RNA sequence: GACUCUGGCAUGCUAUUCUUAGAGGGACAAGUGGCGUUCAG
């Protein structure tokens, strides 16, 4: 049973907001995971990248906790990356799943050469940086597949990228930095300005302003 | 003989001189000094409390808002003014006192406002402080009912209206000179010497200007024609981004802005007293410094401390190994 | 974006900042879509029509959003000259 | 003001500005506020150009009008000097006030008592009310602020140039903003002067309140 | 049976202690004025409010503000409507360039 | 079940008294009399 708190959640709970892309259009924060459960649902697969047990220094000594790196992703669409430290492994995993679901970004997919069929690769070579780890995505021809290390392999397959050349520099052995760098690159896919996106933007009314009368009643 | 709270603070035992010793309950019930309250329970009780009829309270208010003293006075000071006005009215004829007070005349000079004229120990070219002068040095010292008002705004409005005001000395006061603060943005004067932001505009722009009032009802005000006073040297400097939290010290730009509480420990803000009769049995000649508290680590200072540092302009060169907290 | 068949194969068109022509990203939370009322020229009351300006978060951070909105309002005849 | 003879600056408003002292800036100047300044006088105080004040005030009024639900506009003052005024602004217009300390996380922490989503934010002092400006950067809120000469313009979208230090000046600025937003909405005629005298908006200062209860 | 809830009690108590003057003993007038001032989401809830308020003012007519009064205070003449305003010379030049040179209340004060 | 939603009657608005399906109404213990800590019930 989901009882929304945010106005965006209350609109999503009704049939006021139709797609997730509208929430991406006005760059609004998603502060409830149940919205992402509503729009994507059974499409969302979740893949545990890593569980590392850690020792917290306590006044009693040291006691163990677990840190879960979880990549969630709708194929042919969206991903998010979450990290959670908690006492047991199950609660760390579901916390990382929620915290990965709150970070879902869209990925832009383009074409290598001729624009025949669905988009399959990254539109232009993008770059993501996290704590000396540098991860570059390069457009690849159809059928070449994801050529990359296993952790960005999972995150790029979950993004709906079918094929990509990759390059990584720095201490790639630290897994959180490497995952966060490839997550940064696939966010910069839509942050990049291409001649396709050169027509002047028309400004459609925001859901807070489109449905102000519906939010009066609550 | 209307006694202001300044007489009770100063322990001016002048009840034997006058017989019309009257005062408000509010001025005597607001005193926070323990020694004065102890002295109140010892004194012979000939003083009587009253409250003025509010009509003269208005009339006192409409000319205090014209003489330029209305923000300076308190409600209780208006009560004292109204009580002495009513006692003047009941005892003496009312045609003596005048209204619509006289316009100020302007006369400037060259002296800096910080020139230490009228400070007792100082001497330009004899002026000594003798054991015979300590009881004498109170202020500028010169029939039935008077006042014991020591605040300058009180004496200003009284000598503007024409009421004879007297001091801790029995003889009445003829001349009263002091200093006021005037804003050079909105030209509104304040009689409170402590206050640094203007009451009207709120800017840190008040500068010191001397005044003198006569017993006649004339106010004349002396400016300083010195270009050092109105010079904008260290007034424009770049300010840090505003910080919150428990430890932030923003540069204090408005009068009623909110600071986080950073108070000194009770051990640190204690000074050594040597006149105490239990001092010589004390282990050390001086109080121990506080080096154990959290405010010692946070380097909290007394507000009065480090004043000449602030008057150095911020666009200037300090020494290369010092840091200004 | 759009394939050789002609279909618009793209999830959405992101909106661009009115000051810098920069794409406002999906996680730009300091970005603004501001509405300024247009008024009658004979009475001076709200028409119901308004003008819309988008400002990305980098310009707002840099402190130039105020100047940018003022300059766009001069351009659109909302703010008078001088 | 679209160079319209209906919305131009009237004389009695200028007397309000000169008596309250809004033209008197501070002695410091921020470089992003140098456009709004007429000149520095030799005292050091910066004199604010009042036509610029009028234009930015009308931009703020136009932005506040364009919100269908007036409770979506939120008006904030942390220090006492503006607090009473912002309450009156609420009672004039219907905007939601926060007077007093702003609890951090009001706009970001969804599980909270005082959590709320505005659609516009109006601020008395960007230096004093810095915390809602930061919150607004987190949650996509535009901002209108009453900015002096020495004021940071991070996350401020419409910066009204005015003296925000004196009580009469902030009371007047809030009063004029309410007057213009309520004229431009249309519930007041522009030809008749407003029934609300601006002296309703100023700060009480409980010693002055006692000094007024004395003489009545 | 039927019982009233807590939020109805709190909202009714607030709207009574704030605005007892406008209310009457009619159900519908009280309901309309309650919808007029109180920002109430639901119709069923606001009729519950109106019923409980009617019960309260029925029972208090049987038998059994300082901050507001000081806060709503406004004087006879405002301080800004004053006969002489003293201005700097440079402010008068600024007003002259803003077409406002025909003012009568201005008194220019030279820096001396 | 003191949880959530909701029906009966509309000769009312909407493409409309007989069929429709969106919205707006109407019901809230509201009124009366008894029992009641005179208030909760
Ligand atoms: Zn001043």
Author numbering:
A (entry chain C): 59 to 276
B (entry chain y): 7 to 131, 206 to 222, 230 to 412
C (entry chain V): 1 to 82
D (entry chain A): 2 to 217
E (entry chain R): 2 to 65, 76 to 123
Give the exact sentences the study uses for this entry.
Biogenesis of the small ribosomal subunit in eukaryotes starts in the nucleolus with the formation of a 90S precursor and ends in the cytoplasm. Here, we elucidate the enigmatic structural transitions of assembly intermediates from human and yeast cells during the nucleoplasmic maturation phase. After dissociation of all 90S factors, the 40S body adopts a close-to-mature conformation, whereas the 3' major domain, later forming the 40S head, remains entirely immature. By combining yeast and human structures, we uncovered 16 different pre-40S assembly intermediates, most of which represent the long-sought nucleoplasmic pre-40S ribosome.
Similarly, we could provide a complete near-atomic model for human RRP12-B (previously ‘state B’), which could now be classified into three subpopulations - referred to as states B1, B2 and B3-based on the different conformations of RRP12 and the early recruitment of RIOK2, respectively. As maturation progresses to state B1 and helices h35–37 adopt their mature conformation, RRP12 loses its interaction with BYSL and, in transition to state B2, the N-terminal ARM repeats of RRP12 slide outwards, which might be a requirement for its release. RRP12 is a large ARM-repeat protein and consists of 44 protein helices in the center and two long N-terminal and C-terminal extensions. It is primarily associated with helices h34–40 of the 18S rRNA, thus keeping this region far away from its mature position both in the 90S and later nucleoplasmic pre-40S particles. rRNA helices h35–37 already adopt their mature position in human state RRP12-B1, whereas helices h38–40 can only fully mature after RRP12 is released from the pre-40S in state RIOK2. The C terminus of BUD23 apparently aids stabilization of this new immature conformation, and only once it is released in state RRP12-B1 can h18 adopt its fully mature conformation forming the mRNA entry tunnel. Although the very N terminus of Tsr1 adopts slightly different conformations in human and yeast complexes, in both organisms it binds to the same conserved interface, that is, next to rRNA h44–45. In this position, it reaches deep into the h28 of the 18S rRNA, thus it might either sense or stabilize the immature folding of h28 and prevent complete formation of the 40S neck until (human) state RRP12-B1 is reached. In this later state, the far N terminus of TSR1 was invisible and h28 of the 18S rRNA was already mature. Interestingly, the very N terminus of BYSL reaches along h28 of the 18S rRNA to bind between the two KH domains of PNO1, the same surface of PNO1 that later interacts with NOB1 in state RRP12-B1, thereby preventing premature incorporation of NOB1.
